[PDB]
Design a protein around this ligand. Structure first.
Ligand SMILES: Cc1cc2nc3c(=O)[nH]c(=O)nc-3n(C[C@H](O)[C@H](O)[C@H](O)COP(=O)(O)O)c2cc1C
Ligand SMILES: Cc1cc2nc3c(=O)[nH]c(=O)nc-3n(C[C@H](O)[C@H](O)[C@H](O)COP(=O)(O)O)c2cc1C
Ligand SMILES: Cc1cc2nc3c(=O)[nH]c(=O)nc-3n(C[C@H](O)[C@H](O)[C@H](O)COP(=O)(O)O)c2cc1C
Ligand SMILES: Cc1cc2nc3c(=O)[nH]c(=O)nc-3n(C[C@H](O)[C@H](O)[C@H](O)COP(=O)(O)O)c2cc1C
Lengths: 356, 356, 356, 356
């Protein structure tokens, strides 16, 4: 598919965009108070325990073999996996297999189902959610927001009438698993998290700018068909809430949330920063795709590296476990500091909130 | 004409200058609450409704055909258009046509007459103003300030005594249509807006630095004649109030103003930022000229793009209409923030005023 | 002489240093409320009136012809002129003419004698000071501080003991003309100004970093002799109080001072900024020397250029005279803002002070 | 030895790291109030007086000759010298000489022993400490922290259980000399300083980032071995507390500490800055190694240069002695300013603490 081709092989990772993660420093503790072998990376993911506080977030036959590779490696490492949109599989019986195998190959890890928010204004509802969940015996379902991508694509247009949320709220009352609302690379602001929260959504995946740039992907699609919209997309390459800013806004405005910090997480250090900032876990998509494309051992080496990097940051902050990481001392500098200040985030009360 | 030749084909657009608009961020809303097709870009321009909150601002035989192109396309898109200085048409009856074509080809949109503050200093009075208006059946008249251009031009030297403002006030009480006071690239400060406001001026067009650089144009003219003033002009290339700062200072110092945010507006995103910051409409001149020179179809495509970009910023901020855009969430960072703080602009109270 | 050779023809103007004047913005006024021909640049210099608020500051047969040129042009333009150090003329009768000529060629302007603070640590006293004054019928005497130069020069080491100030205080009591204390490229701090003030010094010339870099001059002298001190000098190239910061410190700590704002003043805009910030007049040395070396007509053109640029800044700020310019609206940003804040300069009470 | 090979000949000094000392400005005093020849650089180092407030910090048969050169030059200049880790000398009776020579060739200066904190959880205790000290007749012992280096090295893992401090605390009551706790290039934070202080540690050596980058050194070791941990070390090159930030944090959090400011000290201006910021003395390692390798006269010239540079900064700040330097006027700007602010270092109570 053209989207996968562009994302994996063109220069669109963080193109003219920023996570603001470089504005976050984890304070080095020269006397850690622990040994490396005592570091415990285990944490809760709803009703299950996972081995490392990171998930693979959703990415849409050839698509099913990447999904297979990702799922088996995720299972091995005890990390949760989101699948990409299950709309095609809801509609076409054939496509059901390229999702199913996930649970054949990953019996124990949390698996998160996926449908787009715009589908809720287009006839999708309780049944479809139940089908997407059943299809992979999912432990949760992610509902994704991608208005920026939809705005810049040749075809169709974004529809996010409030009805979607009213329906989602109804759905949440009969679903057997939790709902996560996630972005797709442009981030969740406090106004959006408060709005979602007001309809009963308590679980968020920031998916901020700085990682996969979908506006850049549509720019490329546009250039490829000589569409003038490409020039317009260029103006919006840096559009969105940066991941680090998104983590703060969501944690601040809904302190009881379960929070995935994703969008440009490219190292275990990035993952450690996201968690220390306020996330409960870090999410990754694009670098998982690129490694899985190289093959199973490449993705295994990828996760070994991400996990080493995470434990390195844990060790060097004297953080024996994830709960300790979430309260370790940080510095916030530069644009992220200015962002937080303008946005009314009292850093003093932020600190308190991130640490509880 | 030399000035048009230099503006169109030399490197004078934003030369060593800045709008400060890069310090303005529109907060992305992942659940916009609207569909793209419900976005309404209509707004008021004095007694008329326009289709988009953007105007072409004034730009001075061959200058009549560019005006004709601009005017038929502005009519098509339902956007207001200011003409360039009518001085030559007051002084020569034969220059009237290159303005009279405007109303034949654009019978319904607001059309804004144009005379200089220099003409008012020099004994233009009511009749000249009435004649400029009648010549194009104008819906208002813009009076331009260009002391910087006058300072640096090979020939002549500016006069801006308060007697001209006494004249303007006298004229305004007998005119059939409102007066807009606009700059020409170097922007309107709070002192200047307040002074004008004390003389009954309520409508402003910021025309701040960052776009067409008239000091740069005169520097080039000076270079061309081997005039030593070109070195002095170079020291002044970054002179003036940046467009974003000017929007802020005028809205802050005259809360009730009708305000055009102009000077370096080059995209529908720039336009959306200017309006969200505090302008009622965005103005553009130079890129409209450059597209009109290419032709009617080039300029039609230019406007479709501006409009698409505007609506994309409204969609992605959850702004269903121009009133909502005016109150959407922003971040102010960097030098603009330092500018505002130094100039006594409480950013807390600024938010209140811009949202009303 | 080697110092003039290096200053005039090597890369030492602003080398790795900064005036901080780029952090000072004069607020553009689109309706100035004055005309260009009514602008009055006349100001006071002790008991004389000068035509422009700028002086040539001191610069050390061939040295007497550059002085002669500078003096005749300064007389022509009505601007005060400091001579360079008169030590050699106190020490040798023959060296007197290369100064004396000054007063033959420049009978009316203020002329400022020059002796070093190192001469006061070394046994110059009243008579030597009187002789320096009489030799050129000076209207004031400058005593220069150059400890950085002395530190890094190949030969010898600085002495700035307190008895030299006791001596200056005593001398000042029997002198017929005022004493100005000036630096030589490294700027005057509030601690230094307050100390000088406690001994009766009322008149200061900032000579801050960002213009002529004397540490760079000595570095080059050191390099030219294979002297290892060159590498040490390199580490101190950005040593000193930037001119803009020095102006603020002296104005704030000695509000009643007469203040020359100098050190890196390279245009009439620089000069206008220095005065707006708090100086009574601006000072220049190096670019005058460079022009003088090309000849009298070149220097005449240089002054015409400086004056035009000063009047342009006055015009475009609506400042009818120097007193108006001193209270015109400014913006302070960036490092200078941070400098001022850290040094306890409340930017609100600073405004009050500079405006009186 | 590989670590010396890499430190001395690869690009690892300040690689992707920063001391933050460029954010510290010493205020120039154009009238110093002292002479160069009167400047007194003597200061206390526990029970001894040293000639200059700088030490050589510890660096680990050809390792002995470098040590012998360093020690004899340090003796000549009256500067204290730390040795590298004595672990091998404890285990191997042959290695004792390459440390003991130090004391034959430097009978009078303070000599500082060295063992690593992780040894305390691996069998080392009072006896090994007494041994280390006796072997070189030490005046103090340094216990080093190098967790970041141990994390990234091919072989092994960092062990810093609290037991190590419990043991160290016991040892401290029976040792005949003081204990200094030092980092090794990644700096000491307030949490770590306060933790050490709670176990009785009063003496600290910041060894902050910006100088020798041990994560970089291990990265190169990993590269050379084809180890994938190299890619992970690259992610951590800028990890740690910058030297200037560490000096502020330790002085702030343990105001009566004896404090060595080290990590990236490369000139006497860096040393002066470190001292004025709040250190008692400055420490250097890498540049001493590099000079020692070139030979005795090179190292002699190096110290001459450092000392001249320190006295230059003392002269130019009007600091007659080390006590005066510690209270001289400074400006803190930029990232260091932001770091201190985030970390709750009230810059006003900081000023008091560092000046007492
Ligand atoms: C090829 C590709 C396909 C994607 N498809 C989906 C999708 O079907 N569902 C969805 O929720 N997110 C989708 N995502 C968005 C990711 O889940 C993630 O939110 C975003 O890429 C930011 O993370 P990253 O920077 O680690 O890639 C897709 C991303 C990629 C790269
Ligand atoms: C070629 C040209 C001619 C102009 N002539 C006029 C004029 O006659 N009247 C006037 O009010 N403004 C004049 N303008 C100023 C514009 O109206 C506008 O204020 C300024 O160029 C800043 O907007 P921009 O950056 O979008 O060009 C002129 C601008 C251009 C480029
Ligand atoms: C070649 C040269 C020689 C100087 N000699 C003197 C001196 O004799 N007396 C003194 O007070 N200042 C001396 N100055 C310092 C200047 O008066 C002035 O303070 C300094 O150069 C900063 O101004 P500028 O950046 O405009 O050069 C000298 C400067 C130059 C360039
Ligand atoms: C080659 C080398 C070996 C080192 N070995 C030791 C060691 O044995 N003990 C120790 O405490 N620190 C050791 N250090 C760290 C230094 O003492 C110092 O803390 C660090 O290098 C930062 O200072 P610098 O940037 O001036 O080198 C070593 C440094 C170098 C360059």
């Amino acid at each position: 598919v053209e989207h996968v081709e562009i994302a994996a092989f063109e220069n669109v990772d963080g193109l003219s965009s920023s996570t603001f993660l470089n504005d976050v420093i984890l304070v080095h503790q020269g006397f850690p108070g622990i040994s490396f072998s005592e570091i415990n990376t285990k944490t809760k993911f709803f009703r299950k325990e996972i081995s490392v506080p990171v998930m693979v977030t959703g990415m849409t036959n050839e698509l099913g073999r990447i999904n297979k590779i990702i799922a088996e490696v995720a299972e091995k490492f005890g990390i949760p996996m989101g699948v990409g949109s299950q709309r095609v599989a809801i509609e076409k019986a054939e496509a059901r297999e390229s999702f199913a195998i996930v649970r054949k190959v990953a019996p124990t890890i949390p698996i998160i189902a996926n449908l787009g928010m715009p589908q809720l204004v287009k006839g999708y509802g309780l049944k479809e959610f139940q089908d997407a969940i059943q299809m992979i015996e999912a432990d949760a379902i992610a509902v994704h927001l991608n208005p920026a991508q939809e705005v810049f694509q040749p075809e169709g247009e974004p529809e996010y009438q409030i009805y979607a949320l009213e329906k989602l709220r109804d759905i949440s009352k009969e679903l057997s698993v939790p709902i996560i609302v996630k972005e797709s690379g442009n981030g969740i602001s406090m106004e959006t998290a408060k709005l979602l929260y007001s309809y009963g959504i308590k679980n968020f995946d920031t998916s901020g700018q700085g990682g996969t740039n979908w506006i850049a992907i549509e720019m490329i699609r546009d250039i490829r068909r000589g569409n003038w919209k490409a020039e317009s997309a260029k103006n919006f390459l840096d559009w969105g809430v940066p991941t680090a800013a998104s983590i703060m806004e969501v944690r601040y405005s809904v302190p009881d949330s379960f929070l995935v910090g994703s969008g440009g997480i490219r190292s275990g250090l990035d993952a450690a920063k996201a968690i220390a900032l306020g996330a409960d876990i870090a999410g990754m998509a694009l670098p998982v795709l690129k490694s899985a494309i190289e093959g199973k051992e490449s993705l295994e080496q990828f996760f070994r590296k991400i996990i080493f990097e995470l434990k390195a940051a844990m060790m060097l902050t004297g953080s024996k476990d994830v709960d300790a990481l979430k309260k370790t001392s940080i510095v916030i500098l530069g644009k992220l500091k200015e962002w937080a200040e303008y946005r009314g985030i009292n850093l003093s009360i932020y600190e308190k909130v991130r640490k509880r």
